[PDB]
Design a protein around this ligand. Structure first.
Ligand code: FRU
Ligand code: FRU
Ligand code: CL
Ligand code: CL
Ligand code: CL
Ligand code: CL
Ligand code: CL
Lengths: 526, 523
């Protein structure tokens, strides 16, 4: 099968797409109607009903931000994959759009898997996505059978699109089933695509294809092979140039890696997404210059996708719940995205992912505490019932003798809480759920460099939403995103010093606005 | 004769000792009469009223175990130092004895500091201790002024002693104030003494002296100087020979070091006690063969003293509360000692400090839970209300996928607890107080060797008392001792697995008897 790259797309409809979309819409609205809002986000993207996963089709196009996502419109576990869709002009007030894709073509009949959206040379958007089949025709026992597909929007609003079919087949001979998650970009006079592959020797790979017209593709080479032989697959690959403030471009390769074994604080989650920084000449293989580093050090983060708009590289992740129990799945929804983060390189040359500047517009108010000191082990109340807030704080590392200090959030009447803390014995920032009464527990610890540790200050920017926390360390040099399933009743926030003093130079709380996606007319505040 | 080793003791009485003892008894009794027992130990040694610190005068003599301890008889913070005293015929049932020493001689007039007991060549006990003066005559603001003293018991019960005065003076110009905490022992045909000193260059040292008759001493040399320049003093030195796995003698040097900077999980407390293993040619310098290691990795442990009984080296530590707040101080007492431990060398050549075997006699019963498994993140109640209990468990590390797992103790209705856990991300046993409602919090983490991590099994022996936890890891290869000031109500114990499975191959609980020092109690 030497030509697994057809000259014209192979289009093979087996179901009526509009009728499948219509079924999907009915499924989501029914879950939304009955949905329990206890842990539902006020300012993160989730489906109005049902399970989501990877963010997809991310773009700014025709004056709107668009976020699509893998969606199961019939329940709160993963199932037949669809694309859901939300859009906004400002990244602050979002509108639920129609479901975008439902399985309707032969090569995607078991699911419309992850993909991306790029603006072409004529300013028109094109979608690329993976079509999924079971290899044995029925379920996962026989592994996956995956190909690359393309589609075009029907209108500037992207409220619908027309499928064109398969553009890249799978040489099953040459791979171990896994063959998915495309990203297309242009460098120079040529378009490139990469997607993740498990080779025949079960090594996680990224393959490179090229094109001059976006629909006809040619295999170039293996762009990257994961150096760890336990790593069998690279899901949701990313590959983008990021500029320093010095005028240089570095290539950042990203992937959601399956198969790594956990080691110390690294790679603790079932699968783990991360990046390497290095160089790339077009057609060639990636040359890494750093070891693998996580995008996000928390409990619940996977499958990040990034996109470029006007020199900005923005990334969303899926807050992935891989570990039982998953309390929210009984509530008519499951899963949310992170806030949008901007990718930059910092002064040390490492990747930094601060929240995008637009996130400041979430703040309804500022309660400025000024500087706060705890002279010894103790706690101060910051909120008695904080549902959706951002806390910004700067710790004077130089003056605080505390061994561990930070915030207890979702601190309820039963004594449960999630702890966000600087830990001076390991020299890290932790999110520790040991005291939580719902969800799996454990802790996650984000590294601080020697310079960050000898610095006089540590900045934390902590977003608490009804079901989650995101901790941005030193302006997003590290981030931890974790679910936190608050118990019932008022949810306090406490500032905490353990075993020594804590000097905080600045502490501010901001209440967060709703992003307009939680709205549901069967829910009467009343 | 300013030379610092008098030919005969310098005896200088300035106060009526009996009257000073009577005043101290009245002070302790006032605190005892109002004591709140909420955190008061059921099976550890504390004063009946007041603050204690270092264990002192430790011995077995004329058919009894004796424990003395630094005592402030007038308050529940540190203050003018006396020695308190308990005794026992079995280590299980203890009695309060008369306060032993109050300051009554010029050279100890601001405190009878730490010291030790040894049995001489004729089978007679002698005491050695430090006499403390404020260097400026008032307060700690001008530093310490310290010398070594001796005394003999007046009877086989050790209920009182005759003081003999000062036997080792301080050469002011060779020392930076600190000069204290004697230990005496015999090697070959010679008696030796060591104590801690801060040199003129502010280095922590143990000096060595020798004697023929245990009363007149001769300076020999500096036995040991701590290799870290930040360490300026070595309090409560210890030095004793221990038989290794091959039947060979090793010398273990111990001290309570002042001035180390915390580094990672090491040396976290205000001051830190520990040991090195090495060799000694009698009369020579100690030669370490190991780096410094802590006796105990927990929050509250300091000033351990050891003594020898029928070939066994037994050690007690003070559970030191150096960090505010100290909520027990409102309750008419402050400070308890650890259980007694035996110092041995393990198969890997490192020190092991298991509870002495007599501690098995604390057990009133055995509740055998057998094998327990948690299949995923979860909790199981092991005891609904545990005031004073010992839990023995073996965890199968090979089978358990949990990231962290263990026992929450003192688990009360307000959701507070102290967590004793294996932590798979750091490969350590931790005691974590973050959720406690009373006292300072934080965590402490005891190391496991690669061989211990590779074995596939982890043994914990956890002693819960009303205000404390002691965790004995792998037979006492490591120990963590910490105060745990439980909240009000029933105090549960829960087995906990986080983010994966926990296989416990064996779990046993034993209720602990009272050692009788609390007298009548309310359960
Ligand atoms: O929903 C299926 C999608 O989820 C992923 O496995 C990553 O979480 C992608 O590889 C795939 O396209
Ligand atoms: O109470 C005084 C005693 O306590 C110590 O400082 C150790 O805790 C000793 O060096 C001293 O003899
Ligand atoms: Cl790491
Ligand atoms: Cl509030
Ligand atoms: Cl709120
Ligand atoms: Cl250590
Ligand atoms: Cl009990």
């Amino acid at each position: 099968m030497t030509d697994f790259t057809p000259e014209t797309p192979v289009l093979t409809p087996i179901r009526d797409h509009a009728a499948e979309l219509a079924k999907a819409e009915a499924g989501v609205a029914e879950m939304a109607a009955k949905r329990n809002n206890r842990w539902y986000p006020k300012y993160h993207i989730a489906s109005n009903g049902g399970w989501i996963n990877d963010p997809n089709g991310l773009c700014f196009y025709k004056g709107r931000w668009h976020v699509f996502y893998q969606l199961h419109p019939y329940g709160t576990q993963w199932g037949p994959m669809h694309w859901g869709h939300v859009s906004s002009t400002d990244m602050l007030n979002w509108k639920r759009e129609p479901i975008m894709f439902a399985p309707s073509l032969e090569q995607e009949k078991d699911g419309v898997f992850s993909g991306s959206a790029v603006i072409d040379d004529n300013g028109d958007l094109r979608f690329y996505y993976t079509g999924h089949r079971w290899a044995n025709g029925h379920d996962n026992t026989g592994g996956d059978w995956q190909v690359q597909m393309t589609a075009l929007p029907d209108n500037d609003e992207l409220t619908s699109a027309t499928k064109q079919g398969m553009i890249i087949d799978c040489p099953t001979d040459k791979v171990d089933h896994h063959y998915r998650d495309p990203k297309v970009w242009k460098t120079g006079d040529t378009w490139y695509m990469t997607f993740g592959v498990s080779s025949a020797d079960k090594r996680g790979q990224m393959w490179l294809f090229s094109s001059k017209d976006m629909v006809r593709w040619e295999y170039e080479r293996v762009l990257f092979q994961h150096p760890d032989p336990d790593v069998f697959m690279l899901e949701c690959p990313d590959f983008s140039p990021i500029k320093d403030k010095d005028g240089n471009e570095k290539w950042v390769i990203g992937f959601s890696a399956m198969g790594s074994k956990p080691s110390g604080f690294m790679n603790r989650n079932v699968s783990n997404a991360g990046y390497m920084i290095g160089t790339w000449e077009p057609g060639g293989e990636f040359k890494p210059e750093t070891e693998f580093r996580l995008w996000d050090c928390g409990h619940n983060y996977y499958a990040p996708q990034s996109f470029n708009v006007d020199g900005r590289q923005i990334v969303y992740g899926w807050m992935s719940p891989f570990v039982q129990p998953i309390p929210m799945e009984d509530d008519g929804w499951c899963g949310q995205l992170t806030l949008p983060r901007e990718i930059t390189l910092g002064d040390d040359g490492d990747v930094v992912t601060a929240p995008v500047a637009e996130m400041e517009g979430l703040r309804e108010d500022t309660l400025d505490h000024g500087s706060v000191t705890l002279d010894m082990d103790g706690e101060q109340i910051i909120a008695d019932d904080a549902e959706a807030v951002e806390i910004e704080m700067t710790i004077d590392l130089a003056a605080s003798t505390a061994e561990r200090a930070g915030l207890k959030i979702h601190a309820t009447e039963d004594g449960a809480y999630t702890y966000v803390a600087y830990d001076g014995q390991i020299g890290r920032v932790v999110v520790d759920r040991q005291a939580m009464a719902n969800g799996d527990r454990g802790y996650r610890a984000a590294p601080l460099t020697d310079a960050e540790l000898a610095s006089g200050k540590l900045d934390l920017r902590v977003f608490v939403d009804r079901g989650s926390v995101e901790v941005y360390v030193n302006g997003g040099h590290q981030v931890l995103s974790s679910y936190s399933y608050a118990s019932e009743g008022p949810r306090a926030i406490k500032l905490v010093a353990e075993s020594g003093s804590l000097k905080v130079d600045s502490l501010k709380l901001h209440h967060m606005k709703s992003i307009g996606l939680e709205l549901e007319h069967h829910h009467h505040h009343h």
